[PDB]
Symmetry: C2
Subunit: 139 residues, 2 copies
């Protein structure tokens, strides 16, 4: 499983990366949503975990960009208590889930695992449909 992790808090990002890696995830951490987005595509087999607030492109801006690329590429928003209402609205808008700070390591893991599961199922579904069409065309 893979994760693109974005947060402006250097220390929090490192703690989050270590937790995810020890949980079996391959993590790519970024200090900027823009840099992270550059590596994303509808072919990305992982998930995105981003703070809702960033000094540059914020978390919701990144979310909208991801939604356009592939609505089934899960985005988990990391948020402070004050912004929870915004995160809840984002979920209604298509975001996968949110995790409120401060959060426990095992909780970050359970949230990421649910998102990875959705992405794994979506990619498996697409792979199966590709095979069906490939077989159908051959015949």
């Amino acid at each position: 499983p893979s994760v693109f992790l974005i947060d402006d808090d250097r220390d929090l990002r490192k703690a989050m990366q270590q937790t995810l890696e020890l949980a079996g995830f391959t993590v790519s951490s970024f200090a900027s949503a823009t840099e992270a987005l550059a590596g994303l595509s509808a072919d990305f087999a992982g998930i995105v975990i981003s703070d809702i607030r960033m000094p540059g492109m914020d978390g919701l801006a990144l979310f909208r960009k991801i939604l356009a690329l592939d609505p089934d590429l899960p985005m988990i928003l990391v948020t402070g208590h004050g912004d929870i209402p915004m995160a809840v609205q984002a979920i209604q808008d298509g975001a996968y889930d949110f995790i409120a700070k401060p959060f426990a390591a095992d909780r970050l893991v359970q949230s990421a695992r649910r998102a990875e599961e959705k992405r794994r199922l979506v990619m498996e579904n697409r792979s199966l449909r590709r095979a069906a069409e490939a077989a159908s065309e051959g015949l």
Copy 2:
């Protein structure tokens, strides 16, 4: 989307059922986990939402029974603050997610929708594999 809803609190169960129905779910509500389990099978296309505590078969007992029937049939546990640690352990054990009481209607909806999404993808995956094998055998 369908949901098997189990809770001992008659009033809470009715409020939950109304919220889910207004969110587009077809709901079957039960006052006993035993009665609910009787209608479940690996063919069930919906999800289960159960209180972790019940005077008879409790929520974790129902969870273990469901896990045996089909680990991919999502179970969401409804829990009081005091039992959250037990719910977290249940998730580590295979449960889908948990919702803490008191909870807002829109939050119950977002949790149920994520679970329904997993089940929908799982059933679609199985349907596709069935078709592939059916085609392969015919040829």
